[model samples]
Target: SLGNKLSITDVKAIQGKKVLVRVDFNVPIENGVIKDTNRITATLPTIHHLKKEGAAKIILISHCGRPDGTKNLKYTLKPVAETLGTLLGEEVLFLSDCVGEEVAAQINQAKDNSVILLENLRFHVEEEGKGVDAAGNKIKASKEDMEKFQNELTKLGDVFINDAFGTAHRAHSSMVGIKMNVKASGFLMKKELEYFSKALENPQRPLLAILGGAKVSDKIQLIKNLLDKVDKMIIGGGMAYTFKYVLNNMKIGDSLFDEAGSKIVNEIMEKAKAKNVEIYLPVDFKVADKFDNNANTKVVTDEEGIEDKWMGLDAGPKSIENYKDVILSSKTIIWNGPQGVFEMPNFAKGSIECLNLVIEATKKGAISIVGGGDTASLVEQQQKKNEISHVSTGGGASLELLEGKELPGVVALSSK
Candidate 1:
């Protein structure tokens, strides 16, 4: 359904036009050094494209860590501008503020095709609408001030483009407040939308969804929505025990039991049955005496169940075999969350094995998409992130996309 949002690829007429881009530079920083630059580098293609198209000036706006809507130098974009300059092999004019007459004048005074990075957008309460002030008191921008802030941002450019996929779920001023007629998505946003659309909107045969995590209620809507699209689904991790206890009536002692989500298990099954969607639950689990890396553990089938003092920490051998089968046979695969506690090496086998299958499936020409922090981290741990078809950069944004929710930043774009 999100197949045709306007992107930079569709936009033309960049000849001598000022292009204002909102990108995601909210990267991990330590001691004034950018630990990771992927988010900054990810927007390079879009920036490069704009510059190559004879753009007059390319003004970049992005928020760093939270400054609570106040001028906090600790969360400045100066370092980010320097990182960008190094990556681009050209100097970037770093502005001191994001808005006001001074900022607009600096942008205007700059020569054609100059790359300028403004200070943190979060520095202004008007951007997020609410944040803590310098005195450590919560403050909010008035409606008039918010509009003026947006107006100042709007005055700097003729066209608006957003590449901040990580913050796409947010409706901040930089994301949705630009009052421009030709708003479009940057390349990074386009990739995020296109990849999700490849799997969710329309896909190849035998689409499979591998979902995990703890609370079922947290992913209730995602599961419900995916039921209509997927051919089969594999439920694992802490949430799986709840389904096992509810459906199979299996005894899960120290294993997670979502009492509230337990009530919805029946509805999920009913819907799955009606939709002809095969629901795969772990038949066996890696039961542990204590939730520790060195805990005494043993495999237990659903028939055997778990003991009062034991908890299911990971999927068992049989469950992994079944998962391997499901993954290999699928033409399209989408995964979120981990099958077990991946932080501990002892319980990471199950999750790691399943991820390897997804990689193998990719080699077999299957479209594989992995999203959310847990599953993405699992992929990263194996150093097989590039092996998958798409490992999403935006965790919450991708989750909302998979849950069939339109992002405000995306919706704010000019429709193709």
Candidate 2:
């Protein structure tokens, strides 16, 4: 249904048209080198598709790290351009800057099927669009700045495509502002929205959602939103300790627990009860004396609660079995966050086992969607990424979508 929104498929003619693409090249860099190419690799389908459609020139636009408009050399995208050139098997012309007279002249010189990558968009302050942090501090942009940059950006292409789902949540100039010109969704964006819509809009019966990771505060709104949709919800990871504390005020030791999480959990639990949405928390945990892989460890259950000196590192086997039982029975499953510190092999069982079960469910015709970030990384690490229905490229954006929020990037596209 989301794919019906104006996309590259809707365009009647593309021959010799200048197509500008907004891609998520915000990858991990170390010492001015790209450490991973997953984000770049993800956009190849759309980029290749554009070339195949006889585009006059393919222009790739994206931001790297948070340069804060300083034009910092440390955050330069030269390395990313090199990586993209190698991946596309063509010379990806890299401009020294994103917008200016010289940049426009070079784009005009390029011929059809030529792919060009602009400099980092964040090199200019207006690119981030007066971005604000969670604490409410604003970056501050004037109307003049946005207009000047947007005007220069729009000159390079005849059509626009947004393939960067990672930055979909923000209202940045390149994402929403540049869409004033002809626009459509790229292949990657269409796929991300379609999978999410399938699970949330018209899912099969008995949908189950697994929520984990740290901080109950981050997921309070997400939990509340899913109460009306999912049949059952499972809570694990470090945040589960907060609920364990709220349900019985149990001794949680030094494991991570949100200080104000109790109040939010009370509100969520009350609402879930009214909706009859069964909520499950960890019944047993793998406790450790210190926060280290080699720390002395033991399995603690409801029979023997956590002590003051010990911390829970992962969910115990019993709790994993309980989670798997729900996973196997559900026709649709959505998972976000890790059940434990999956970075360490010792505490990886709970997260790995749960993910494996979801993979098994996918084989049995169940729709399974894995959220981005930690969960996506683990699935890739285990070589199970392709087996799952969809692994999101957006981390914060995906969570915001799950919370039932409209993304500016998605809204900015022209309608079908």
Candidate 3:
């Protein structure tokens, strides 16, 4: 687990230790102001645990936004520092820069049980260039400029903890590079890995995967990877139109379809058929008069004589019922993407009904893994996030992992 690598248990056991923690605080911020502190608050458990263990000085490190090293004011970490301080109920130290003699001095002078947030690491280019060595130092320093900046900053920490699963796929300096010397997973990352392993590697029998979203292209690889693993695969959302077009020979007027990837789609279908893995597509759709929010919706089962002006917006009631029936019969369920345009109230039934079905699955002891950007949002919006087995924070990372791609952050961790 990403969280376990930086176990607070280890930090707590080593009192008077200078623990450097890499956390992800990339929550949406507007105009140099933090709109949400949920991500910061999520990391609090490990921070509190380390503080309890008498950690001499807690050095909190994080990146805000993509600056590519020009030092744009909007990408600053000042607001994050303020938010962290508020959450900790103490005056958290906020360093102006990520690495320098001055920041090192601040770390040396800071008291135990207090927190210090380093500045945006992207402020210096070398931070992302090369990783640290086994001795907790940067490998190469060519700088008369930011090169020197990297060398000194690595010296501030005696131990390293990585708790940022969202950026776990990136081999950024603070994530994998800094870990070369003193790397460990924080509490959250540890839990994330544990849950992911259980769901993917050793899940219970009769596993069911529910996939939806705008484009079939996004999950093409995932379908290929899970070809032989799942007992049944349920696909819906606008992408379903592509399968409807290819498999059922429907016109699928104006609905989403991937022409370039249709061959890949057919290949997946053939593989699933060969494996005897039952792959389900929406049998009926909720069609809209127009793509606009307020468009009138109607259920269309067959595309015969359908007006070319209309488009399918969401799954129809009967299709959702069949989806729910599959959800209830499974021992394990992995869901990604929204069933429809859940943001629009009229088209929210499919997503909402699916959530209720997942909750019922959980009650029956089924392992449920919900991945995708809007899936998490809708789960939280419907107050079912805590009930679900796992909700991945990474969008592209989770998708790629589902497709069996190698993740750099997981690879960078030192083996036990």
Candidate 4:
């Protein structure tokens, strides 16, 4: 049970209040121009709702690409403010700093229903706390510094609305600390939680999970977590070879193979078998002598499985069809990654075909949730992102939620 999390819609009054909204604006930028506007677009509903409900000043706070607590103009939110204004078709007040005397002065000047976008949160050196790396090593920070920053941030707003689901896993100041004040979930945040809750808790039966992408170690825990809930699991991308290697000792020459990951593959397979959860591995792959689009490539498969020279860049046609069969049979499906390197047209066939299958299943009334990042981007590229049940804005956060971990940002919101 999700228990007592209050939404912005639950707020009796937002009129004349300084509502600090923590949004995910960490989008790709190149040469001071926003590359993708999906993250900004995703929060429009929340913004519209707040303005319509008579919120006086909507203070928007978000971080850009990792500045790691240093003031970098390249990672500034100035360009983000411009992009947001253009999208909203209204002038959004931009502050040079997230917190300071000048920042507080600017906040005082904001009018009713007006939007103000803050500078990058990570610029303060106190936004992110002591976080761990991929190998679980601690990246140290000062607790005293973080507390001071949080205290200053809390002073800028009367109500806190967390809409940054991408950074929900983090226990940063703006995310979790400021919730000690008046706090609630923005529309985007609430919807994300709602969809995830439905999928994980009260989903329609025969739940199917498709896990792909390059790293086996990245999703091993997610696979283990899904094993208890899902009826069937399909593995693809470079990760499939790691599984194949353990299953049949197939020589994946020069392909992405992890020895430690091979051991994880074996463990997961054994666990899935023990749990009676059917796990599907790719039957064939599009192999090439070198990792290039123009490289001589062929569909490769063996009597037992596949062996590659250079490596598999994509799932073979037969494997795509094989995976399609399972996808169509399922009533509920959640896909996390592409079946292949979808960015390149030559190698995109497998992923594109598989995505089409998922879309077809969706048409048949199957509940489909596509996780963010490559899969979601692929859907967007195909102009069919909205066709699915839910496409998450946060890839890593979505996986964490599926693994049944409580996100600090979600937990930080005030109870109804």
Candidate 5:
């Protein structure tokens, strides 16, 4: 379990040491303004604790976009540092570079207890090891150059703490290239690992996983993996239509149908039966003439099937009722993806109702976890994140974790 790994809260591990923290400050920016600040604020706990614990200095490192190993000022972290300083009500020194003697000198000269944000790590090919150059030519970092880069980074901090759960699946330089013997997870990373550990390891009885969204090929691994752990599963959203068509040969008009995904629908059912996991899929749906908020909508059952040129936008009332019962009967629920096209208000009912039911069950002492960028937006749009037990900040990283895969970033941490 990740709990066996050292946590940043361990005062003896970080006190009076220059701490290098890997944070996920890859926030969405527009016209010099950050569109979202959740990633910045999520790491505040660890930063605050580091300062309060008398750390010599706090150096933050992260990457943004795909600079492809060139000095691109457009993807700079200068504005993000200012935003973080405002959030902390303090000054955050922004360095123009991340590695080498000059950057080390700037960090060395900084005052004790100071918070510093380094430039993007992707500015160097050594961070990713392979990247396209500014001229669009493919390039790979040499072994000698990579070693030097990692060694230079090793000198920037006394201890390493990873708080960037969003990038945990990638074995990048800042994530896994550091050679620090005293390494640990920051508070945010600890929370993600802890919650995922609790849900996947010793979850309460009758654990139910509600899966939706994305392509069927992408979710097949997840479904097959969860079949080993969950007692029940509710399949909904765009992929549900594909499941219906693949299994029952039901007519699906313009609804999403995955060609390669259909080939393995039988494999999923066989695996589920072999694991003794009961799978529940939507039987009715909200159909739309077109993909738009003002589109003409109609309700139809699985038997009726979708009409030609029409699409299924949301799960119908009957399916929602079935999902409600499952949610109430389950002791723990892990929700991933939306059950419908939630971006449009008219088609958001199915996803919204399921979220409400999850909140309701949460109030009744049920542990609920929400993942997926699309599904997470539903709770945030409704401002109901507090009602759920855990809302993951990582997108692809969380999905891979659910698939029973080990995150390289987490595996790189020093054991307790």
Candidate 6:
């Protein structure tokens, strides 16, 4: 399925080649220090491969936290450098500047088979734009803006590789713009493409997709795109209530319904019906009066059957059975979110039951790809990450890539 595509061996062949790798080292830090090493751990395989293949120099670039560079000690990548160096059993030279004579000299000064991390990319006002009021998310730029960033950063390497799947969806200069100058997709990105192809193409006979969490709006494009590709699509968590409100006239007492996508939800249902796609929703719900797990919960036959004062907490027994039956019959399964409020111990059964079924399916030879973010945390919390075929490194990136869209970071790389 990965026909004619460049493999890890091809990347390895660039041994003695100066490589620029964009990795997602955006881990939370406290008091100017890295708080965790798991994100660093995820990229170790690619780092190990680069050194083992004798790369001339491994120039690693990663962003940590959102600091527009005032040296606000909190957003520094210094802690990340220490963590990477410790794990690789070698010293990693840290560069305060991402693009400049000093940083360039430091990279050239470092010995072959060495690693170095750049400072926060957002420090430069050019890396950021007039961001939105909501999340302050903006990376828009003029042609000159793009050219300047590209010219400054690409000088540090002979090739470009993107392992930062988390930022792959954006059209940032570091991600998409730099590609116009160098080769793209590190060993990690190749692995990502390969696994995605397995699920989207030639997926075992019964392909099942499970999507949950807060809003139908969050995955509107994803559902619209995957309907024709999978055999059965299951909807759970809070979003299902909004769908049920439309499908069966349920009265959900403010349990996360999005009026914006209500009509679109019906369109998706009709589309699924036309495509002969089995769309499974929760048959029953675990209802609560105060949205609290221990707050007088009840098993309701239908979401529409719930009391006006209560909100659905989790999938009831019947919905679990409905979802599990499809999971048990499938050969390829892709899960994105939790079935319920798994964070709260009392409301965790629905997610746990569904996860256990996925584990069982894996034991039976089914290919299970666990998409990360909150779902990844859930799997790790349960200590069941090893049970799945692949736990994707990026939640949004994996979904966007599987939806048949080109990643900005990937598109920025040199094609040939």
Give candidate 1 misplaced runs (Cα > 4 Å): none
What order do candidates take by TM-score, descending?
A: 1, 5, 2, 3, 6, 4
lDDT of each residue in 379-411, candidate 6, tens digit only? 999999899888888667777866667766555
Error of 4 at 388 (Å): 1.5
Top-down lDDT ranking: 1, 5, 2, 4, 6, 3
Off by over 4 Å in 5: 307-310
Residue-level lDDT tens digits of model 5 in 1-416? 55577777664866679999999988887768998897888888999999998889999999887688887888898899999999999999999999888998998899989999999999999988888877799999998888889888999999999998889898778877788988888988888888887789898878999999946988888888999999999988899888999898888899998889989999999999999989999999999898899999989999999889999988999999987788988888999889999999998999999999988988998889998688888899999988999999888899899988888898888887
- lDDT by candidate, in order shown: 0.89, 0.86, 0.77, 0.83, 0.88, 0.78
Candidate 4 collision pairs: none
Error of 3 at 336 (Å): 0.7
**Residue 162 accuracy (lDDT) in model 2:** 88
lDDT of 2 at 264: 84
Flag regions of model 3 displaced more than 4 Å. Answer: 1-6, 10-12, 130-153, 179-182, 303-305
TM-score of each: 0.94, 0.90, 0.89, 0.86, 0.94, 0.87
Local accuracy of candidate 1 as per-residue lDDT tens digits, 154-235: 9888999988888888878888789899998888888888888889888997999999998899989999999989999999
Candidate 4 lDDT, 1-416, residue by residue in tens? 44367888888867877888999998999989888897889889999988888888899999988676667788988988888899899999899898878899888877668999989998766788654544556566688878888888888888888888789888788887784456888877887877777678878878999989998888887889999889999889988888787788787777788677777777898899899999888888888888788888878773334443578889887888797679898889989889888887889998888888888898998989987888888998999977898888776888788887878888888888
In terms of lDDT, model 5 sits at 0.88
lDDT, candidate 2, 1-416, per-residue tens: 35446877778778889888999888899997787888889888888888888999999899887777657778888888888889988888888898889998898887668899988898787988665544556667799889888888888788999888878899888877884456888888888888898899889968999999988998888888888899999989999998888888778888887987767888888998999999889889999999998889999995578999899989999999997789999999989879998988899999999988998889999999988878888998999988999998778898899998889888888878
Number of backbone-clashing residue pairs for each candidate, in the order shown: 1, 0, 14, 0, 0, 6
Candidate 3 similarity to native, TM-score: 0.89
- Give model 2's TM-score versus the native structure: 0.90
Residue pairs in collision within model 5: none
For residues 266-352, what per-residue lDDT tens digits would candidate 3 score against the true structure? 788889989889988877888888878799878888545135878888888788889767889898888877888888888999989
By lDDT, the better pick of 4 and 5 is 5
